[PDB]
Amino acid sequence: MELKNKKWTDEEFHKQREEVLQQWPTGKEVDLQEAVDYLKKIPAEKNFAEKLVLAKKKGITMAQPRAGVALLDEHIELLRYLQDEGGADFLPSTIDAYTRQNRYDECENGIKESEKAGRSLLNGFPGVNFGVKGCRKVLEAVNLPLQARHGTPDSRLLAEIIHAGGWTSNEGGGISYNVPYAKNVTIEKSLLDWQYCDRLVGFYEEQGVHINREPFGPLTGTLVPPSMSNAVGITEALLAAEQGVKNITVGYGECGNMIQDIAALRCLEEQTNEYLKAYGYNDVFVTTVFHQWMGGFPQDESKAFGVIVTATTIAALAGATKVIVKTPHEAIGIPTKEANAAGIKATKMALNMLEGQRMPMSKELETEMAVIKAETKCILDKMFELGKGDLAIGTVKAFETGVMDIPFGPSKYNAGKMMPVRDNLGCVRYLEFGNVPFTEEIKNYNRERLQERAKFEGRDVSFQMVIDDIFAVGKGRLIGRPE
Amino acid sequence: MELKNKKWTDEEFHKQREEVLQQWPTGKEVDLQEAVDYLKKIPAEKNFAEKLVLAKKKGITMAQPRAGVALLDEHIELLRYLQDEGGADFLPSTIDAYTRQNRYDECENGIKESEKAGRSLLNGFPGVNFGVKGCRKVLEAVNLPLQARHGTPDSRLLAEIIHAGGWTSNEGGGISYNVPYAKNVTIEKSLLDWQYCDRLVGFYEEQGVHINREPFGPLTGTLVPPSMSNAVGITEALLAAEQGVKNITVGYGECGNMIQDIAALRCLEEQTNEYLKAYGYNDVFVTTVFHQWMGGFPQDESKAFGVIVTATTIAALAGATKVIVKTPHEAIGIPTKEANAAGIKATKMALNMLEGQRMPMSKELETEMAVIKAETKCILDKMFELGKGDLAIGTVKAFETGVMDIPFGPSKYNAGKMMPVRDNLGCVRYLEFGNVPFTEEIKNYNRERLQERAKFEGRDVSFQMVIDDIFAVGKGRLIGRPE
Amino acid sequence: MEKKTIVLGVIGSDCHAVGNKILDHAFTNAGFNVVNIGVLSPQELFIKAAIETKADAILVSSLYGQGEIDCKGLRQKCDEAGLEGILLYVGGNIVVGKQHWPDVEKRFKDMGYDRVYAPGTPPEVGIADLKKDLNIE
Amino acid sequence: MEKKTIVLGVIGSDCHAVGNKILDHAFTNAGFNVVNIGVLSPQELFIKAAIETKADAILVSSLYGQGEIDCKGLRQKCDEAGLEGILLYVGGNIVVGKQHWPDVEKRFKDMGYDRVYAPGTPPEVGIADLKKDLNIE
Numbered sequence A, B: 001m002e003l004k005n006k007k008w009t010d011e012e013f014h015k016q017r018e019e020v021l022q023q024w025p026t027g028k029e030v031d032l033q034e035a036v037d038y039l040k041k042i043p044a045e046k047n048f049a050e051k052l053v054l055a056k057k058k059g060i061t062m063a064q065p066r067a068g069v070a071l072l073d074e075h076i077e078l079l080r081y082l083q084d085e086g087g088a089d090f091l092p093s094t095i096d097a098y099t100r101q102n103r104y105d106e107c108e109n110g111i112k113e114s115e116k117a118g119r120s121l122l123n124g125f126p127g128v129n130f131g132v133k134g135c136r137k138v139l140e141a142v143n144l145p146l147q148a149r150h151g152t153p154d155s156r157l158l159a160e161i162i163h164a165g166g167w168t169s170n171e172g173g174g175i176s177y178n179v180p181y182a183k184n185v186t187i188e189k190s191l192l193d194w195q196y197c198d199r200l201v202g203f204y205e206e207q208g209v210h211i212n213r214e215p216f217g218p219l220t221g222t223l224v225p226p227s228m229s230n231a232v233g234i235t236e237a238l239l240a241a242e243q244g245v246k247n248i249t250v251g252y253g254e255c256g257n258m259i260q261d262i263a264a265l266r267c268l269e270e271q272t273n274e275y276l277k278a279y280g281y282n283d284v285f286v287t288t289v290f291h292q293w294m295g296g297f298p299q300d301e302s303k304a305f306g307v308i309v310t311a312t313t314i315a316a317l318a319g320a321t322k323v324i325v326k327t328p329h330e331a332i333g334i335p336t337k338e339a340n341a342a343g344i345k346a347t348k349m350a351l352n353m354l355e356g357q358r359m360p361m362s363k364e365l366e367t368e369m370a371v372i373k374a375e376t377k378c379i380l381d382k383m384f385e386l387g388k389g390d391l392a393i394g395t396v397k398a399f400e401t402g403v404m405d406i407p408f409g410p411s412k413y414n415a416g417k418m419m420p421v422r423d424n425l426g427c428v429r430y431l432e433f434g435n436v437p438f439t440e441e442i443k444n445y446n447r448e449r450l451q452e453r454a455k456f457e458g459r460d461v462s463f464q465m466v467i468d469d470i471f472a473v474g475k476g477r478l479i480g481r482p483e
Numbered sequence C, D: 001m002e003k004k005t006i007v008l009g010v011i012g013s014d015c016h017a018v019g020n021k022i023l024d025h026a027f028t029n030a031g032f033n034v035v036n037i038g039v040l041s042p043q044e045l046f047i048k049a050a051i052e053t054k055a056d057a058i059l060v061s062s063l064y065g066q067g068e069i070d071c072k073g074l075r076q077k078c079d080e081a082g083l084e085g086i087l088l089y090v091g092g093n094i095v096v097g098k099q100h101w102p103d104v105e106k107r108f109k110d111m112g113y114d115r116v117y118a119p120g121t122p123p124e125v126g127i128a129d130l131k132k133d134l135n136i137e
Ligand code: CNC
Pocket: A066, A067, A094, A096, A097, A100, A123, A124, A151, A180, A181, A218, A219, A220, A221, A222, A294, A295, A296, A297, A298, A329, A330, A331, A332, A333, A334, A335, A408, A409, A410, A470, D013, D014, D015, D016, D017, D018, D019, D020, D022, D023, D059, D060, D061, D062, D063, D064, D065, D066, D089, D090, D091, D092, D093, D094, D095, D096, D097, D098, D117, D119, D120, D121, D122, D123, D125, D126, D127
């Protein structure tokens, strides 16, 4: 298929469907007619799109963990515990990493070995191997909406199965589930395959079935500047809306400075809505998700609660629709059900301790919002220019030319030139600009902020500071101050 | 002695000292000449007053737990653990409640029972019984400054012993260590006995020995409106300054609405400094202490961290000089050394995750500060009027007339007429004014804020809402919503 | 249900007052005549109020941790005072620290307490137990 | 230290990349020739690199949890490729979840790994161990 930012026709999509369903035998379980009726029988309380509308209506932040294991009954018991003992508001099913490379052979071996060992040897739930039947068992066993959370460049078959499975949200996008997760997939290919995933949701919406989509904001989780993160999320929202998506949650990963983070989430929501309406998408319901600190965690569990709950406070005051919960096991391994419930309980307690509270506007907030919107607009403007009006083609070219560049992204299609680092108040800034297309004024502000850190620490800003910042939270603080 | 707000003469003070030292045989261990030289040999790192100046200079919030047990060696091991494993910045010694009623016989029995039980049957360290010798053993065994934390209407002998003991701070005041802690002690008598405690620090400062004093801000810890709390602390700061105290930490107990709490602490510090200078006390170094949530905690330890770390975030953004740490055992019993270290670790992690960050000014913050300063001034103005310029006499008369009235205070000298409750955003407001001398404008603002809660909840504002608010945090949330 | 008198207070050198107000309020609303001697109450005050008011029960609250010392001996003093068999309840946070609750409960029943309650006990539990023990449930 | 060659990568379907960059930096700074094959690397790529560059050691990082599956069989493949006795190190977060470390260490040694490292291992520990094992301090 050629890549263009244009809704697939029904015939185009159907032809791709027939190919995709053949990629594993559980594809035969997918019947779109039957799935529409199944989906429409789900109660609103178990529909992710509808519960997001409710959360917005009520001015509530909802909490959602990460969770998944190889075996179906074990996965179900886990989610029920997060629901009942943790008090989760939304449930995930974190998909294993073999599924994410379409290696269902390795998933199957992992299922068998997990059975034999009495414990999960996979780092998630192999949704394609469990099929529509297995995915429905999960949904039927719980009492909250379900969402696939993963990191998959080619998620077409997974999307078919989990949506026919009654899971009413799918996380990802053609940039955010490529560059942080893959080394060898072209941007064009992952954009095309994510157009499929968006178009499937577009089909369902056309039949009256509401299904949420969540571009993955945090990307590599590692010092991602707000304007670059937000440029990705806005782009993925626009590309999804073109295929017919109507309920979108845009996301952001915590950087740690409360005013920068609130600025970032507010800019993200405001510019997502602005861009959607400017491009004629006038019926899209936008929500936000804030991810608690996606960098390295301290090993000490008490210190981990310090990160979890400060993160939550920032989310709450930002007016996030959703917050993704970290646990006291984060530095060590996939949390037990108890550790995860602990993180969810700490989070919800913090949210309820802050009911209705929002950060009021200040000069500082206004200033940082102007900075983020200007930086973001520079990037998006250049993308539209490179694509001669077509944002999908603009995205491919932006990656090729370093205009879009994600810190630490393993993809060989990522330039790897731009380098981030914190300023003296812990705001993430641009240390090396690469080919990111900012004005000198914009670059100047970044350098001015960073020079304050050089003066305070008595060392030049540098890659050693970047290293220091990568380790800082695991070592007990936000900013990687000297020894 | 008659009560007036005037510095005791050297003769007057000495005559009282000779009486006070006879109240238990360890009084014979106090030699003022020897104690000044002992104190002057303590390194600055272990001087509470000097470390507060440092914290202010560095724009750091320092963390301090509560802790104390009956036996000397056990108490030392406990504090070493909080220092070393917890990372405490300051050390307490929480004094047992028998000591607080001058029942040294019951302390002695308690020590004997604790030895025999192999565990503390006292809820603190019996400093008067352990004497100057025991108090010095504690100081010599630790590497941080030490402060007596307690709740004692007649603290004269305790103060003599802990200061000669090298503890370079004493918490308390004649209001804050009476009304929340006693039933039958007159306000005049506790004011007189706290003039002694302040005058002793005045003596030491005249010899060049620096000792901090901390009025106890939170009072009963139960829905105390900021303006009433602050009026008490400003009064206690002024009464201390008149006796020659030069290093003062004024305190505030978290109410839970971040903007209210930051407004409260800023107002407290600004008006403390304003009042000190207006009354000609021009050499007093003022710092602040924010106490994490002093009302009931949830039993669930993960939820407890929710409260601990949200509270710390508020302290950090407020610019508090010091924050007092709660633990995951708060709802159940005096923490183990491990539960206490856990609370300190979570607190310090949060502080370091927020290094240098402050809440910026907003219209909301400005508005709340203006409300709190006006309410506070109203109370202080009336106190000065009742005392015909003398604030000590004014304080006695203010309690007699209900001008000053502390919610839930057990003291029979507290009117018990004013009733607090939260508004719809969780700010503590005045529900019933009693004789608190506010103008109608001030009263109507409180009423308007509360009517918003009635509208939202669909019930009239009432004492039932007060009850609900008393239980809310233990039940998982800040505001006592119905059902 | 029908009318009955309790003595209520907080024992020893304990000044905690909020729960005392809630308990007074709750037992009063349940129909009891609450003789509230308040905080910082020694054993003798509980006994003197119980005599003067002919109380059906004594509800001892202990929050500050020294309950194990403060509560020892009350039953004997009640006996010596002519209040043999009076109902004696104790609750709050009655020992120092988190402890294994069955051990603690046993400990205070051995002191002569009829009923012993853990941290965070709702007033409604004590009210239902007192109604049952007074045969007015 | 004397100059020696290592192969470094992240195995299986694992995309975690930041620690790989830090390890490369640190072992390079220590004087090793680091042959970094990067993320999402199957066993065969580790062995091909080791052959082409005459590596002294292969450092397998596994962060995403599926190391138990992914790491099995490498020692045998190395032998078959003629890399008998080559040093094989494994570290990161090599099993699913918090586990008893002595059990995990024996499991991977029994699989043929020479050294096995727990979560949060500093690069410096590995550097010291490898100098010791290579007799270069
Ligand atoms: C950033 C991050 C992290 N990740 Co991811 C998550 N979420 N993650 C990500 C992002 C990575 C971006 C990228 N491409 O790099 C992101 C969001 C994409 C991601 C994704 C995933 N992650 C996943 C998981 C499970 C994990 N991830 C963690 C590693 C979870 C980490 C949790 C944590 N707090 O540590 C984490 C937060 C921090 C990792 C990091 O960069 N640290 C900084 C780095 C410098 O240190 P390091 O990586 O630990 O490496 C050092 C040491 O381990 C050591 N070392 C490492 N290898 C060796 C080898 C040797 C021989 C030696 C001597 C030393 C070492 O030295 C290194 C350098 O200093 C994890 C521990 C979190 C957890 N507790 O659940 C967990 C592994 C679980 C386990 N082993 O039981 C996912 C399945 C999603 C999920 N369920 O959470 C998914 C899988 C992707 C895939 N295909 O692999």
